[PDB]
Amino acid sequence: LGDFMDKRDASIKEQLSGVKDTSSEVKQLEEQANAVMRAARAEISAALNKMKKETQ
Amino acid sequence: VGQHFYWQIGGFQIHGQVLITSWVVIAILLGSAAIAVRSPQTIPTGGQNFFEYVLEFIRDVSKTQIGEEYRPWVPFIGTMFLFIFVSNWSGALLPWKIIQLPHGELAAPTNDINTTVALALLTSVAYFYAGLTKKGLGYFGKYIQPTPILLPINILEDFTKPLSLSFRLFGNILADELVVVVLVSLVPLVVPIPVMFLGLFTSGIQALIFATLAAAYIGESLE
Questions:
Q1: What role does this protein play (chain B)?
Q2: Which residues, in sequence order, are CB contacts of B151 under 8 Å at separation 6+?
Q3: Which residues of chain B are within 8 Å of residue A4 when distances are taken between CB atoms?
């Protein structure tokens, strides 16, 4: 019965570390989406500015 | 009425009633607990809640009294509760004045001193086992720490801890059964049943105060 006390509790606790891990991964997805969209934006900004000045 | 016994001979004399009464407690403890551990479930079904809530109660009176290392001593205190809880509830509830042994009564395993001083020694070994395992074998809790002149106070405290814990459990069960024995001789059973409910109340409590105080000497030895 001791294992059953642990099993229900560890499983309940495990879901807790899993839902926390999933929330940390969605925060890292938001930060990578931030970096990839500003990556494309700053790519275009720098490329057009430099190529503009050079061919001017 | 009767405070005597019949003895059984195996080279020495031992009480017939105590062994026999105790066996039913053993068969009703293993026979009912092991019917629920046959096929357990994740969410506890009907009947497993009561055996889980007992086990969660034993963890309460072990962790509060011992400490962080309660978990090895759970099956000991779990026996010293349940072997004394069911032994008292068998005395009041199981009708044993219908069965007639030719020499003695059958009420409880704890009506003789032979059970209660054995259970007071099984909990006495336990705090000498915990006292000599965790701390040093050379010097342990009887060492005269606050003052050197406290020696006869602390030597005699060794004797009083199993003895006062035995006659507490021995007397109140022998008293409770005798009130049932005496009042039946005066009156039929419709009058003594509030007195039996006052007795069955303290019959389970003196088991609880045993296992609470039995764990309380464990935590004293570990310090």
A1: Key component of the proton channel; it plays a direct role in the translocation of protons across the membrane.
A2: B144
A3: 40, 52
